[model samples]
Target: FLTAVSSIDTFLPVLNEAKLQWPTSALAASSEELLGGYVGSQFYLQDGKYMQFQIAGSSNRCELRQMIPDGGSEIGWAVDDGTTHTATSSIVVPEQVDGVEEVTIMQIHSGEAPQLRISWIRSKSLDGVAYEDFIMSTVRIGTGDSSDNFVKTHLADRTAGAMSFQIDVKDSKLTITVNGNVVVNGQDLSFWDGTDSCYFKAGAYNNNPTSESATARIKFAALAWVDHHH
Candidate 1:
């Protein structure tokens, strides 16, 4: 006999769709949007409270990072124009997180500074998800340490609207394009040392003052990836 219509297993199909790709190929990756991983801030669940994960200190941020193949030469994402973010207060004003004055939205890290540090600035880029409608910056790091590494500017315009921003990596080549326009091309990845491959991260990673705190909100309508392992 069939199970009840309200069976808990009703969610089985949805779970399967996310965890596996039927009739899949070695080179055809599955699709995803909200990735799960280590939450940077502290958290808890209480009765009828609106908050589950909470951060009550400066430099305290909430974020989510994706876990993919340990090492590879191809990576990228197609972000929407509706996404946004914001910081609490000025960094270096009260206290500094990481000895810098900025807040992160998304980043691709190689263990340090030369990371794809997508951020929102207090004095410069301040369009938060609460008010603004798109991304502020997109950078690529290749050489040196996080302190004095090779920082390549892909999108630097503070007023540049976020529509269809896409960055792709293949065979050590990085490309940044917006609205079908090639903003940065021919970026060499010779500095992306083969010893340690990197992964993708997006959320609120802030550098704030100690006197006051801030909150960051990041939204992803969809997340998709390609299969190059074949």
Candidate 2:
């Protein structure tokens, strides 16, 4: 039942800025070849729409912060490879009071059947096991049931863009709502040993921009490693 102080929730989760980039920025494309997005830059949507999200200069992993309007109880927004998002999805980071809390994103490997995973920090290392193929995060992944691989698509026939994601930090274990439905429980999130993006980017995942044609709308996203009752 709390709210954000300029984006900080009333529950007040204790977060230690990653010393490096708080949240990593999403990547963008040039013509056909994709490239790394500027650390703190803006881009345009494929439909001539314009958007911008700040990249808080990364250290090694992706860190995220979000904007919460005044006098509200929910947060909604989009995360994308580029600041100027095209193929995006709706999201919201609710408030919590303890344990690991987060509203984050990771790339889905199309070749790997494309599944979005949420990692956790047990002790100190990351427990980034895919909780399950979160059907809600599927934009370009696919739409049919698991038995239908042919129905699976790298990009759908009705979309114009793709989506990539990063972890956003918040002050509470706010529930992540897609279109307003609570999906992932905030407290179960496992923070990683390295920077936030270390879960999927930087090393094993080839620190390159994972490409896709997805557009995302992130209005009130959030994050945190724990929610302090203080």
> Largest lDDT belongs to which candidate?
1
Off by more than 4 A, model 1: 1-59, 68-101, 112-114, 124-148, 152-162, 208-212, 228-230
Q: By TM-score, who's the top model here?
A: 1
Q: What does candidate 2's lDDT look like per residue over 33-107, in tens digits? A: 111222222221211222222221112233232212222211232222122111123222112113222222333
Alpha carbon lDDT at 182, candidate 1: 69
Q: Which stretches of candidate 2 lie over 4 Å from their true place?
A: 1-16, 20-39, 42-62, 65-180, 184-228
lDDT of 1 by residue, 45-155 (tens): 122221122223345554433333342223332221111111111111112223334555455555444346655554432323232222344444445446344543435
Worst 10 residues of 2 by lDDT: 198-207
Alpha carbon lDDT of each predicted model: 0.37, 0.24
